[PDB]
From a paper:
Residues 88–101 of hDPPA3 forms a four-turn single α-helix, which is not kinked and markedly differs from mDPPA3 complexed with mPHD. The contact area between the hPHD and hDPPA3 (ca. 449 Å2) was smaller than that of the mouse protein (ca. 1360 Å2), which is concordant with the weaker dissociation constant of the human proteins. Intriguingly, the α-helix of hDPPA381-118 has no contact with the hPHD moiety in the crystal.
DNMT1, a maintenance DNA methyltransferase, and ubiquitin-like PHD and RING finger domain-containing protein 1 (UHRF1), also known as Np95/ICBP90, a ubiquitin E3-ligase and recruiter of DNMT1, play pivotal roles in maintaining DNA methylation. A maternal factor, developmental pluripotency-associated 3 (DPPA3), also known as Stella/PGC7, has been identified in mice as a strict inhibitor of chromatin binding of UHRF1 and regulation of its cytosolic localization, in cooperation with exportin-124–26. The binding affinity of human DPPA3 for the UHRF1 PHD finger was weaker than that of mouse DPPA3.
Author numbering:
A (entry chain A): 299 to 364
B (entry chain B): 84 to 107
Write the structure that this text describes.
Amino acid sequence: GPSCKHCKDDVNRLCRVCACHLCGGRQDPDKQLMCDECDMAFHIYCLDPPLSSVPSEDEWYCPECR
Amino acid sequence: GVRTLLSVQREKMARLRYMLLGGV
Ligand SMILES: [Zn+2]
Ligand SMILES: [Zn+2]
Ligand SMILES: [Zn+2]
Ligand SMILES: [Zn+2]
């Protein structure tokens, strides 16, 4: 083999490693930002505070790496 | 540009597509 040992690429399990590091959900992959430091995924609406949109910059860093 | 999970997933799909074919 899989690409994720933690969820064995079971798309019907939550995974905070290859999906949203905060809630684990794989829904709205278009709204899951990839930290340009640790390469985790984050729902814009899981961040505290939530981002109403996908940032307009060239890089983004999650609350754990900033 | 900020990368999304979707963008990353699409790139892996594209890479896979080329090997699915046979690399050309
Ligand atoms: Zn996983
Ligand atoms: Zn989430
Ligand atoms: Zn990070
Ligand atoms: Zn963490």
